[PDB]
């Protein structure tokens, strides 16, 4: 069984006093006129999903509903919030309770507290570990269903339980119907009266007149046409395209090399025509540092490059800080310079247990220049020297210019769907639109096309060299044609 939520399930969203104002708010409310599941207690206490949050309501004549259970398994295997109201004493506990196969009341704990004719409404939500309880009790004269009307709920309790709640169950007193409605992130307009009591409400996503009340900040709408929204078509599925290459990039040949070059004569290895899995380098605990100046290290798996170069050499530990864009010093200026617009990551680890002996084979002296009483000096690295120990540093320089990408990370491609609105990813380039066949003659060296706004106009599919046009999915202003609200609540939409 299901019923109509109507206008029930709005609560005072904050401890801020307001009056005579049409204030607007976004919080997890019950959506207006949505369905709520209707349960019965005659001649029904199942476990329900909690989802993003719950409105709960019940109707009483004899105080049958006395409690709630919240958790994931509700079987003593996890912590579960228990609320019970027996006679005049409200009891709250969050123990790893052993609940019955079918919990009811007859007629490692982290918290404990002890204190139809009646409608008792509640709101439960679980935000960053905080279980927030709002409620309202009101007299009623109705047995069949939830009464229609409006009256908002105050917040009463906020329990810092830190419990992951996915399911909940109620507790009945056996010798009282109840409703369960899912909260959603719907913006509201709320009529605070002179006393500051919310006396009316308008759900924004209910219907086009309600959008118009949300747009004008008014419960009354004048005769006219109002631009409430922009209609935009949504995509269906994502499309991921990368060259179908299975070769793996030789990072091991750079990072696990028998010998590193000196900084005065640093090596520059080209990485191309391969799959670059950067999760290995990032997750590895062997590195003393992994600092990215270009892109974030976790994005490297999706993103891909025209080329990647690995600059490999040995420096003294205290000089690691100098290998960065914007830095100056005797190393940054004299022997190894990066562009100040450098894109990439600097990875380094000590070699105190490998290169140190003393080891005098390491000598030091524009961006990416190799400069092959003298300017030439060297180090004697010994195992007994931290800031004076040798470090192996590899600088990964990434070229992200829009051109055919030779280095693309470990991500599987999908099939391509034409003439449908889709979320696409071509060699790390993303966007949303309709991919169609085209007559745009890209030259063999061209990979991407562009519009006046510098947005992508067309792309060359990286697996099959054909050109696809990108046209954003149909969109436009909505407008609501409405007579006076007094004349009618009926509306028409452009």
């Amino acid at each position: 069984a299901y019923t109509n939520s109507f206008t029930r399930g709005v609560y005072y969203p904050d401890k801020v006093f307001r009056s005579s104002v049409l204030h607007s708010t976004q919080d997890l409310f019950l959506p207006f006129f949505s369905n709520v599941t209707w349960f019965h207690a005659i001649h029904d206490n199942p476990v329900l999903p909690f989802n993003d949050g719950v409105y709960f309501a019940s109707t009483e004549k004899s105080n049958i509903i006395r409690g709630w259970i919240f958790g994931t398994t509700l079987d003593s295997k996890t912590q579960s919030l228990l609320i019970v109201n027996n006679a005049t004493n409200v009891v709250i506990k969050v123990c790893e309770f052993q609940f019955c196969n079918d919990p009811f009341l007859g007629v490692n704990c982290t918290f404990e507290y002890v204190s139809f004719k009646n409608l008792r409404e509640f709101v439960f939500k679980n935000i960053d570990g905080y279980f927030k309880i709002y409620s309202k009790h009101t007299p009623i004269n109705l047995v069949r269903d939830l009464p229609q009307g409006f009256s908002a709920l105050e917040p009463l309790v906020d329990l810092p339980i830190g419990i992951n709640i996915t399911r909940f169950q109620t507790l009945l007193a056996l010798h009282a119907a109840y409703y369960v409605g899912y909260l959603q992130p719907r913006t509201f307009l709320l009529k605070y009266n002179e006393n500051g009591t919310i006396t009316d409400a308008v759900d924004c996503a209910l219907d086009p007149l309600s959008e118009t009340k949300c747009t004008l900040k008014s419960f009354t709408v004048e005769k006219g046409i109002y631009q409430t929204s922009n209609f935009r078509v949504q995509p269906t599925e994502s499309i991921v395209r990368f060259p179908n290459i299975t070769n793996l990039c030789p990072f091991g040949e750079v990072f696990n090399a028998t010998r590193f070059a000196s900084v005065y004569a640093w090596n520059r290895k080209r990485i191309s025509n391969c799959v670059a899995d950067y999760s290995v380098l990032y997750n590895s605990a062997s590195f003393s540092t992994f600092k990215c100046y270009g892109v974030s290290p976790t994005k490297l798996n999706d993103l891909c490059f025209t080329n990647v170069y690995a600059d490999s050499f040995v420096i003294r530990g205290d000089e690691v800080r100098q290998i960065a864009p914007g830095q100056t010093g005797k190393i940054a200026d004299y022997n190894y310079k990066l562009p100040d617009d450098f894109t990439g990551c600097v990875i380094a680890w000590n070699s105190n247990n490998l290169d140190s002996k003393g080891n005098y084979n390491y000598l030091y002296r524009k961006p990416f220049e190799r400069d092959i009483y003298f300017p030439l000096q060297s180090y004697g690295f010994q195992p007994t020297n931290v800031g004076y120990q040798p470090y192996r540093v590899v600088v990964l320089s990434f070229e992200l210019l829009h051109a055919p990408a030779t280095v693309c990370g470990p991500k599987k491609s999908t099939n391509l769907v034409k003439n449908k609105c889709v979320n696409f990813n071509f060699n790390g380039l993303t966007g949303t639109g309709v991919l169609t066949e085209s007559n745009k003659k890209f030259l063999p060296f061209q990979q991407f096309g562009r519009d006046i706004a510098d947005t992508t106009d067309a792309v060359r599919d990286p697996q099959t060299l054909e050109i696809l046009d990108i046209t954003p999915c149909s969109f436009g202003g909505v407008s609501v044609i409405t007579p006076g609200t007094n004349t009618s609540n009926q509306v028409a939409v452009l």
């Binding site: 270009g294 892109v295 974030s296 976790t298 994005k299 999706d302 993103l303 992200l400 790390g428 380039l429 993303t430 966007g431 006046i452 706004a453 510098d454 947005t455």
Partner: protein, 48 residues
Amino acid sequence: QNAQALNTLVKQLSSNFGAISSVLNDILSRLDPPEAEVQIDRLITGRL
């Protein structure tokens, strides 16, 4: 005059305004939120 005003407005989308890229998706696909937000604020200020 109106055509020129609109063409100018559209061309401004190609400007970086101090950001690493004029393309919003390229910022988002490359930077984590704590850094992406800075680059985006630069574009928002310029475009607004």
